[PDB]
Coordinates of N, CA and C in Angstrom, one line a residue:
Chain A
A1 N -131.0 -168.9 71.2 CA -131.3 -170.3 70.9 C -132.2 -170.5 69.6
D2 N -132.9 -169.4 69.2 CA -134.0 -169.6 68.2 C -133.6 -169.1 66.9
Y3 N -134.0 -169.9 65.8 CA -133.8 -169.5 64.4 C -134.5 -170.5 63.6
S4 N -134.8 -170.0 62.3 CA -135.4 -170.8 61.2 C -136.9 -171.0 61.4
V5 N -137.5 -170.6 62.6 CA -138.9 -170.8 62.8 C -139.7 -169.9 61.9
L6 N -139.4 -168.7 61.7 CA -140.0 -167.8 60.7 C -139.0 -167.3 59.7
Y7 N -137.7 -167.6 59.9 CA -136.7 -167.2 58.9 C -136.9 -167.8 57.5
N8 N -137.3 -169.1 57.5 CA -137.6 -169.7 56.2 C -139.0 -170.3 56.2
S9 N -139.5 -171.0 57.2 CA -140.7 -171.8 57.2 C -141.9 -170.9 57.7
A10 N -142.4 -170.0 56.9 CA -143.5 -169.2 57.2 C -144.1 -168.7 55.9
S11 N -145.4 -168.2 56.0 CA -146.0 -167.6 54.8 C -145.6 -166.2 54.7
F12 N -144.6 -165.9 54.0 CA -143.9 -164.6 53.9 C -144.8 -163.7 53.1
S13 N -145.7 -162.9 53.8 CA -146.6 -162.0 53.2 C -145.8 -160.7 52.7
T14 N -144.8 -160.3 53.5 CA -143.9 -159.3 53.2 C -142.7 -159.4 54.1
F15 N -141.5 -159.4 53.6 CA -140.3 -159.7 54.4 C -139.1 -159.0 53.7
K16 N -138.8 -157.8 54.1 CA -137.8 -157.0 53.4 C -136.7 -156.5 54.4
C17 N -135.5 -156.9 54.0 CA -134.3 -156.6 54.9 C -133.4 -155.5 54.3
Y18 N -132.8 -154.7 55.1 CA -131.9 -153.6 54.7 C -130.6 -153.8 55.5
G19 N -129.5 -153.8 54.7 CA -128.2 -153.9 55.3 C -127.8 -155.3 55.6
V20 N -128.6 -156.3 55.3 CA -128.4 -157.7 55.6 C -129.2 -158.6 54.6
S21 N -128.8 -159.8 54.5 CA -129.5 -160.8 53.7 C -130.3 -161.7 54.6
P22 N -131.6 -162.1 54.2 CA -132.4 -162.9 55.1 C -131.8 -164.3 55.3
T23 N -131.1 -164.9 54.3 CA -130.5 -166.2 54.5 C -129.3 -166.2 55.3
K24 N -128.6 -165.1 55.5 CA -127.4 -165.0 56.3 C -127.7 -164.7 57.8
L25 N -128.9 -164.4 58.1 CA -129.2 -164.0 59.5 C -129.0 -165.1 60.5
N26 N -128.8 -166.3 60.1 CA -128.5 -167.4 61.1 C -127.1 -167.6 61.5
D27 N -126.2 -166.9 60.9 CA -124.7 -167.0 61.2 C -124.2 -165.8 61.9
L28 N -125.0 -164.7 62.1 CA -124.5 -163.5 62.6 C -124.8 -163.3 64.1
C29 N -124.0 -162.4 64.7 CA -124.2 -162.0 66.1 C -124.5 -160.5 66.2
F30 N -125.5 -160.2 67.0 CA -126.0 -158.8 67.0 C -125.7 -158.2 68.4
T31 N -125.3 -156.9 68.3 CA -124.9 -156.1 69.5 C -125.9 -155.0 69.7
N32 N -125.8 -154.4 70.9 CA -126.8 -153.4 71.3 C -128.2 -153.8 71.0
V33 N -128.5 -155.1 71.4 CA -129.5 -155.9 70.7 C -130.9 -155.2 71.0
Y34 N -131.6 -154.9 69.9 CA -133.0 -154.7 70.0 C -133.8 -155.9 69.5
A35 N -133.6 -156.3 68.3 CA -134.2 -157.5 67.7 C -135.7 -157.5 68.1
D36 N -136.3 -156.3 68.0 CA -137.4 -156.0 68.9 C -138.8 -156.0 68.3
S37 N -138.9 -155.6 67.1 CA -140.2 -155.5 66.4 C -141.1 -154.4 67.0
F38 N -141.8 -153.7 66.2 CA -142.7 -152.6 66.6 C -144.1 -153.0 66.1
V39 N -145.0 -153.4 67.0 CA -146.3 -153.8 66.6 C -147.2 -152.6 66.4
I40 N -147.6 -152.4 65.2 CA -148.6 -151.4 64.8 C -149.5 -151.9 63.7
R41 N -150.5 -151.2 63.4 CA -151.4 -151.4 62.3 C -151.1 -150.6 61.0
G42 N -150.5 -149.5 61.2 CA -149.8 -148.7 60.1 C -150.7 -148.4 58.9
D43 N -152.0 -148.3 59.1 CA -152.9 -148.0 58.0 C -152.7 -149.0 56.9
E44 N -152.5 -148.5 55.7 CA -152.2 -149.4 54.6 C -151.1 -148.8 53.6
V45 N -150.6 -147.6 54.0 CA -149.5 -147.0 53.2 C -148.2 -147.8 53.6
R46 N -147.9 -148.8 52.8 CA -146.7 -149.7 53.2 C -145.4 -149.1 52.6
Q47 N -145.2 -147.9 53.1 CA -143.9 -147.2 52.7 C -143.1 -146.9 54.0
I48 N -143.0 -147.9 54.9 CA -142.2 -147.8 56.0 C -140.8 -148.2 55.6
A49 N -139.9 -147.3 55.2 CA -138.6 -147.6 54.7 C -137.8 -146.3 54.8
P50 N -136.4 -146.4 54.6 CA -135.6 -145.2 54.7 C -135.9 -144.2 53.6
Chain B
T1 N -99.2 -143.6 56.3 CA -100.5 -143.2 55.7 C -101.1 -144.3 54.9
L2 N -100.3 -145.1 54.2 CA -100.9 -146.2 53.4 C -101.6 -147.1 54.4
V3 N -101.0 -147.5 55.5 CA -101.6 -148.5 56.4 C -102.9 -147.9 57.0
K4 N -102.9 -146.6 57.2 CA -104.1 -146.0 57.8 C -105.2 -145.8 56.8
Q5 N -105.0 -146.0 55.5 CA -106.0 -145.8 54.5 C -106.8 -147.1 54.4
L6 N -106.5 -148.2 55.0 CA -107.2 -149.4 54.9 C -108.5 -149.4 55.8
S7 N -108.5 -148.6 56.9 CA -109.6 -148.5 57.7 C -110.5 -147.3 57.4
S8 N -110.9 -147.3 56.1 CA -111.7 -146.2 55.5 C -112.9 -146.8 54.8
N9 N -114.1 -146.2 55.0 CA -115.3 -146.8 54.4 C -115.3 -146.5 52.9
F10 N -114.9 -145.2 52.5 CA -115.1 -144.8 51.1 C -116.5 -144.8 50.6
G11 N -117.4 -144.7 51.6 CA -118.8 -144.7 51.2 C -119.5 -146.1 51.2
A12 N -119.0 -147.0 52.0 CA -119.5 -148.4 52.1 C -120.0 -148.6 53.5
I13 N -120.7 -149.7 53.7 CA -121.3 -150.1 55.0 C -120.2 -150.4 56.0
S14 N -119.1 -150.9 55.5 CA -118.0 -151.3 56.4 C -116.7 -151.2 55.7
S15 N -115.6 -151.2 56.4 CA -114.2 -151.2 55.8 C -113.6 -152.6 55.9
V16 N -114.3 -153.7 56.2 CA -113.8 -155.0 56.3 C -114.5 -155.9 55.3
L17 N -113.8 -156.5 54.4 CA -114.4 -157.3 53.4 C -115.1 -158.5 53.9
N18 N -114.6 -159.1 55.0 CA -115.2 -160.3 55.7 C -116.6 -160.0 56.2
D19 N -116.8 -158.8 56.8 CA -118.1 -158.4 57.3 C -119.1 -158.3 56.1
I20 N -118.7 -157.6 55.0 CA -119.5 -157.4 53.9 C -119.9 -158.8 53.3
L21 N -118.9 -159.7 53.2 CA -119.2 -161.0 52.5 C -120.1 -161.8 53.4
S22 N -119.9 -161.7 54.8 CA -120.7 -162.5 55.7 C -122.2 -162.0 55.7
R23 N -122.4 -160.7 55.7 CA -123.7 -160.1 56.0 C -124.6 -160.0 54.7
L24 N -124.0 -160.2 53.6 CA -124.6 -159.7 52.4 C -124.5 -160.7 51.2
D25 N -125.5 -160.7 50.3 CA -125.5 -161.5 49.1 C -124.6 -160.9 48.0
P26 N -124.0 -161.8 47.1 CA -123.1 -161.3 46.1 C -123.6 -160.2 45.2
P27 N -124.8 -160.4 44.6 CA -125.2 -159.4 43.6 C -125.4 -158.0 44.1
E28 N -125.6 -157.8 45.4 CA -125.7 -156.5 46.0 C -124.7 -156.3 47.1
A29 N -123.7 -157.1 47.2 CA -122.4 -156.8 47.9 C -121.4 -156.3 46.9
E30 N -121.6 -156.6 45.6 CA -120.6 -156.2 44.6 C -120.4 -154.7 44.6
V31 N -121.4 -153.9 44.9 CA -121.3 -152.4 44.9 C -120.4 -151.9 46.0
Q32 N -120.5 -152.5 47.2 CA -119.6 -152.1 48.3 C -118.2 -152.6 48.0
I33 N -118.0 -153.8 47.5 CA -116.7 -154.2 47.1 C -116.1 -153.2 46.1
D34 N -116.9 -152.8 45.1 CA -116.4 -151.9 44.1 C -115.9 -150.5 44.7
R35 N -116.7 -150.0 45.6 CA -116.3 -148.7 46.2 C -115.0 -148.9 47.0
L36 N -114.9 -150.0 47.8 CA -113.6 -150.2 48.5 C -112.5 -150.3 47.5
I37 N -112.7 -151.1 46.4 CA -111.6 -151.3 45.4 C -111.1 -149.9 44.9
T38 N -112.1 -149.1 44.5 CA -111.7 -147.8 43.9 C -110.9 -147.0 44.9
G39 N -111.3 -146.9 46.1 CA -110.6 -146.1 47.1 C -109.2 -146.6 47.3
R40 N -109.0 -147.9 47.5 CA -107.7 -148.4 47.8 C -106.8 -148.3 46.6
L41 N -107.3 -148.5 45.4 CA -106.5 -148.3 44.2 C -106.0 -146.8 44.1
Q42 N -106.9 -145.9 44.4 CA -106.4 -144.5 44.3 C -105.3 -144.2 45.3
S43 N -105.5 -144.7 46.6 CA -104.4 -144.5 47.6 C -103.1 -145.1 47.2
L44 N -103.1 -146.3 46.6 CA -101.9 -147.0 46.2 C -101.2 -146.2 45.1
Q45 N -102.0 -145.7 44.1 CA -101.4 -144.9 43.0 C -100.7 -143.7 43.5
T46 N -101.4 -143.0 44.5 CA -100.7 -141.8 45.0 C -99.4 -142.1 45.7
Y47 N -99.4 -143.2 46.5 CA -98.2 -143.6 47.2 C -97.0 -143.9 46.2
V48 N -97.3 -144.6 45.1 CA -96.3 -145.0 44.1 C -95.7 -143.7 43.4
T49 N -96.6 -142.8 43.1 CA -96.1 -141.6 42.4 C -95.2 -140.8 43.3

């Protein structure tokens, strides 16, 4: 049911997508769904990427 | 063989142009489209020869 709440209308401090475009996320369907988010503090080395 | 060469990634995220166009923006979908184009062109040339 939910979209556009933080997809566009939020203070994007950092928002980086791989394999997909942020603006196209409202038209897609996801399988084996995690859509989960991992809540951590992660120090400050902002190199969480492939 | 020709028909079976269409379901090949050739080093792209997918073998379907519709999925690439739906999931991805043009300036950085161009590279996936390019790899698919090169692979399919090579297969067609081999068939014709």
